[PDB]
Design a protein around this ligand. Structure first.
Ligand SMILES: N[C@H]1CC[C@H](CNc2nccc(Nc3cc(C4CC4)n[nH]3)n2)CC1
Length: 283
C-alpha cells in the first residue's frame, strides 16, 4: 500500500497538542468526533479521528480544493487521522427532521442553501453522491452546511458518468440503483428525498430493509407523499422536478435555484427554534 505514503504526504507536521488545545461529541464507526478551540484567534473547531483509507484521501483532497460557505470547511490534518474542520454547534439536520415539524418557509431555506452547495460542487465537476439529512450540519445562527465527502466522484468531459452503487439506499437515485450511467443530477434526487425527510420525518421505505428499499426504488421510480394535500402546489412542483425519473427532465441545481418555491424561503434565523427544539427532544 503505497497509498499510505500518499496520505502521509498530505497531512500537517505537528504537534496537534499546541494549536487547538483539547476537549467527544457524537461518533459513528467510520471514526469518532470531538471538539476544541484555536489558541490564536479564539476559533472553535471539530476534529474527526482502516478500513479502506483511500476514501479518507479523497475526502481530504476534495474538501480542501472545494471551499464554499455552504460546505463544512476543512482546516488541518495530523497523525489514525486528525482531520480538523469547523464546528457547527446546531447539529445535524437529522435531529430536526425527525423531532420537529418544519413549515414550507423553513424547508425552502434549507433546500436553497443545499442547492447552492450542489450548484458549486457540480460546477467543479464533483458529485457528492451521499446527500441526506445526516450529512447536513447546522450552525447556531441557522447556517446550513454540507459534509462527508468520502464518496465523492470527480468527473471530467472524458468520463462524466459513473455506474457504481454508492451512497445510502433510501436516498439513492433510480439510475444509480440500477447501475446505469449517471451524473450530478443524482445529488438532486437525493435532495428531493431529503425534502421528503423534512416533510414526513424520514425517507420513503425506511421501515423496509436496505435491499428491499433498493428493490422498491428500482421498480417504483418516483416515491409517494403520504399526504400530498398538506403541501402547496409550488412545493409539490419543486419536489417533482427533484424526483423526476427522466434524468433529462430532472432539474439541475442551477435551474432549481430559480424555482418559485425558494422564493418563500424564510431567513436562516427561523431555523434556530428548530435547533433548540431538536436539542430538547434529544436530551
Ligand atoms: N454524517 C455526520 C453525522 C454527524 C457527525 C458528527 N456529529 C455531530 N454532532 C454534534 C455536532 C456536530 N457538529 C459538527 C461536526 C463537524 C465535523 C465532523 C464534521 N463539524 N460540526 N457533529 C458528522 C458526520
Amino acid at each position: 500500500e503505497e497509498i499510505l505514503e500518499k496520505l502521509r504526504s498530505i497531512v500537517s507536521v505537528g504537534d496537534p497538542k499546541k494549536k487547538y488545545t483539547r476537549f467527544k461529541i457524537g461518533q459513528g464507526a467510520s471514526g469518532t468526533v470531538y471538539t476544541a478551540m484555536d489558541v490564536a484567534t479564539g476559533q472553535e473547531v471539530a476534529i474527526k479521528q482502516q478500513p479502506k483509507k483511500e476514501l479518507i484521501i479523497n475526502e481530504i483532497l476534495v474538501m480542501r480544493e472545494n471551499k464554499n460557505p455552504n460546505i463544512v470547511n476543512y482546516l488541518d490534518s495530523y497523525l489514525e487521522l486528525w482531520v480538523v474542520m469547523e464546528y457547527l454547534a446546531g447539529g445535524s439536520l437529522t435531529d430536526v427532521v425527525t423531532e420537529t415539524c418544519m413549515d414550507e418557509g423553513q424547508i425552502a431555506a434549507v433546500c436553497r442553501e443545499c442547492l447552492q452547495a450542489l450548484e458549486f460542487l457540480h460546477s467543479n465537476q464533483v458529485i457528492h453522491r451521499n446527500i441526506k439529512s445526516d450529512n447536513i450540519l447546522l450552525g447556531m445562527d441557522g447556517s446550513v452546511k454540507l459534509t462527508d465527502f468520502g464518496f465523492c466522484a470527480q468527473i471530467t468531459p472524458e468520463q462524466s458518468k459513473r455506474s457504481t452503487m454508492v451512497g445510502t439506499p433510501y436516498w439513492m437515485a433510480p439510475e444509480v440503483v440500477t447501475r446505469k450511467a449517471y451524473g450530478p443530477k443524482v445529488d438532486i434526487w437525493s435532495l428531493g428525498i431529503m425534502a421528503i425527510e423534512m416533510i414526513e420525518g424520514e425517507p420513503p421505505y425506511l421501515n423496509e430493509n436496505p435491499l428491499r428499499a433498493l428493490y422498491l426504488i428500482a421498480t417504483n421510480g418516483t416515491p409517494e407523499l403520504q399526504n400530498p394535500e398538506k403541501l402547496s402546489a409550488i412545493f409539490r412542483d419543486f419536489l417533482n422536478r427533484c424526483l423526476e425519473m427522466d434524468v433529462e427532465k430532472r432539474g439541475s441545481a442551477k435551474e432549481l435555484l430559480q424555482h418559485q418555491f425558494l422564493k418563500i424561503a424564510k431567513p436562516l434565523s427561523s431555523l434556530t427554534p428548530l435547533i433548540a427544539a431538536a436539542k430538547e427532544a434529544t436530551k
